[PDB]
Amino acid sequence: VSQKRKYRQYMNRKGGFNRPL
């Protein structure tokens, strides 16, 4: 099987500079 590659956001986050999980 294969799962959609869970990606993240770079710009316009409105959150902390560090990463969410």
Partner RNA sequence: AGCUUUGCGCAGUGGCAGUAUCGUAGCCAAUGAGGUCUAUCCGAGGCGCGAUUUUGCUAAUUGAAAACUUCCCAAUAGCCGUGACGACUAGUCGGCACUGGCAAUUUUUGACAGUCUCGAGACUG
In the complex, the residues that contact RNA under the rule CB under 7 A are 4, 6
Alpha-carbon gap, residue 11 to 1, rounded angstroms:
31
Nearest CB to RNA, comparing residues 4 and 14: 4
**How near is the Cβ of 17 to RNA at its closest, in Å?**
22
Joined together, the tokens standing for residue 11 give 């710009």
Look up residue 2 and give its amino acid: S
Nearest CB to RNA, comparing residues 2 and 18: 2
Rg (CA), the chain: 11
**How near is the Cβ of 13 to RNA at its closest, in Å?**
14
